[PDB]
Design a protein around this ligand. Sequence first.
Ligand SMILES: N[C@H](CNC(=O)C1=[SH]c2c(Br)ccc(F)c2C1)C(=O)O
Length: 288
Amino acid sequence: RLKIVTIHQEPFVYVKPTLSDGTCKEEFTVNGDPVKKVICTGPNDTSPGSPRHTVPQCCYGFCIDLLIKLARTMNFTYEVHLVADGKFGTQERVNNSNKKEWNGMMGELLSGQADMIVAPLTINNERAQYIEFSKPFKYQGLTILVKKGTRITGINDPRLRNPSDKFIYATVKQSSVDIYFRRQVELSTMYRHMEKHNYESAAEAIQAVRDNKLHAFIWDSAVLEFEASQKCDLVTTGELFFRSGFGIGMRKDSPWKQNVSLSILKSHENGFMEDLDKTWVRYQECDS
Ligand SMILES: N[C@H](CNC(=O)C1=[SH]c2c(Br)ccc(F)c2C1)C(=O)O
């Protein structure tokens, strides 16, 4: 029985409380079919100062549908939890030593706290040195979320290249975004500005953009284009860098990998991923 680890990230993974009775609210998709919901245990409260608690919650979204398809196809049982530190996963020196460890879903996978990461997880070489990825289940990139009426030319935008406190930008801590900017020597000035303003989660950075507390949020286009398309006040701008995929994550040399990739290939071939897009990504006008 596989331990699935995932992370709150609309529209791939919604996270909601159970009802009083421990069930999940009965909901239907835009097409009228039941919304599939799985119990995921994890931290409910992340707001600093208040106690944390690991409780049963309700999970659904692109990635949860994808999990259910994988489980049925490949005939496995699972249980799902949210990553305890709330993070995607970067490699960082621990305990003020020279020893390095992965945080986030990365670290949980490596430690055996999870067996499979099922999430909008960016594929790259840094992470590929430690784990294995499926073939992409979704192709995407980096863009920028801003308030309507802002446009950014791209990575050479002066507001990015020559920063001031008049235009604040950030991303999420312990994401591959933060590391890419950390490592690229040509992006040092951007990194140094951002390290001061990064957020613990996407949700928080997004709220900051809406509340005019952050001017620009650098993040996954698959997420941000969904967010911008459902919030009339917010738009995307810029296509930074290169294109990138989301993959299932598994430990090196895992017996799962081949059949997971095969299952994702089928879903690219047969219209299932497109059906998921018509359910979770593009289906109505902005109303938030
Ligand atoms: N999905 C989250 C956030 N996503 C990431 O950290 C990235 S970095 C990066 C670059 Br550079 C170029 C093109 C891209 F699409 C992405 C996505 C995660 O896995 O941490």
